[PDB]
């Protein structure tokens, strides 16, 4: 009735799944960008339109740090312009200074262990496995679940599916 139904907004769903995790690290390739390798970033960078709503709700609630392995300086610029093209930077949300770049996969583990987020989002299983010892929660984004994930490493096909639903 007026008194006995309910319906949550996307922000409430995202914040619920975050489970008070107000500091988050997340890679770029595949999970936020359509590109799937640093070599592609030398040609173009494109924010996934399907990740945008959930991504913005995360930035309003959580301190967010994006990070990615790149091969040159021009790739960094292409990435930053892509994030801006999609409006990912907002007052009260993500700032351009909190987008990090490295040259090695394991370099991301150094970023995360320094930042000590509540959540890390990645696709490399060796990184998720290595960080489960240190990071409270992780989302491992993959097509198929690894045969073995840590009990504090959750798996899904996309950021928007895991945090954007219940």
């Amino acid at each position: 009735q007026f008194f006995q139904p309910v319906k949550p907004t996307l922000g409430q769903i995202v914040r619920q799944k975050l489970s008070e995790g107000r500091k988050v690290t997340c890679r770029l390739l595949g999970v936020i960008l359509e590109e799937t390798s640093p070599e592609e970033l030398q040609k173009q960078a494109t924010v996934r339109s399907s990740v945008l709503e959930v991504l913005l709700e995360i930035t309003k609630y959580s301190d967010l740090y994006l990070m990615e392995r790149v091969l040159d300086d021009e790739s960094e610029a292409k990435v930053l312009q892509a994030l801006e093209n999609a409006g990912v930077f907002t007052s009260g949300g993500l700032v351009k200074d909190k987008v990090l770049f490295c040259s090695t996969e394991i370099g991301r583990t150094s970023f995360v262990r320094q930042l000590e987020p509540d959540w890390h989002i990645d696709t490399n299983p060796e990184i998720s496995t290595q960080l489960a010892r240190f990071i409270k929660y992780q989302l491992h984004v993959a097509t198929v679940k690894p045969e073995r994930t840590a009990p504090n490493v959750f798996t899904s096909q996309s950021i928007e599916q895991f945090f954007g639903s219940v």
Partner: protein, 154 residues
């Protein structure tokens, strides 16, 4: 006790009797305690710390210059040889290799040189050191620059 005051007077004199361009170092002797100093150092050019200003706290012992001063970062800094949570610095001239030949100014210069030329060994920040030892210089510069922009630019 009076020898320390004489030495600290030569150093207070020298930091006042200078208007040199490129004041990469600015030692500020304290109002009421001659043995408490603060320094402002500019991040060295061509490093991820360029454009930042870092505050150093000096605690001078009374046997100074025969005993090294206690120096630490008050500004947060991402560096292999600086403990991120405490600002403590791993530099041998502040510990074993101290000599009365050193001064507060030259200590600031050694710190600036350390910022420009880290030592991935002797690490107080293993994540910062791991990035350098593993060859991920872009990653080190990226995170060191972020912290410079977020913590060392007022």
């Amino acid at each position: 006790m009076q020898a320390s005051r004489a030495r600290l007077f030569k150093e207070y004199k020298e930091v006042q009797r200078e208007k040199v361009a490129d004041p990469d170092i600015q030692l500020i002797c304290d109002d009421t305690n001659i043995f408490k100093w603060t320094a402002l150092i500019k991040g060295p050019s061509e490093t991820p710390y360029e454009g930042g200003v870092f505050q150093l706290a000096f605690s001078v012992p009374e046997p100074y210059p025969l005993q090294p001063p206690q120096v630490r970062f008050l500004t947060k800094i991402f560096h292999p040889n600086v403990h991120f949570k405490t600002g403590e610095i791993c530099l041998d001239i502040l510990k074993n290799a101290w000599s009365p030949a050193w001064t507060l100014q030259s200590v600031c210069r050694a710190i600036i040189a350390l910022m420009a030329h880290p030592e991935p060994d002797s690490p107080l920040n293993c994540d910062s050191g791991n990035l350098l030892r593993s060859g991920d210089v872009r990653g080190f510069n990226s995170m060191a620059q972020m912290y410079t922009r977020l913590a060392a630019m007022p």
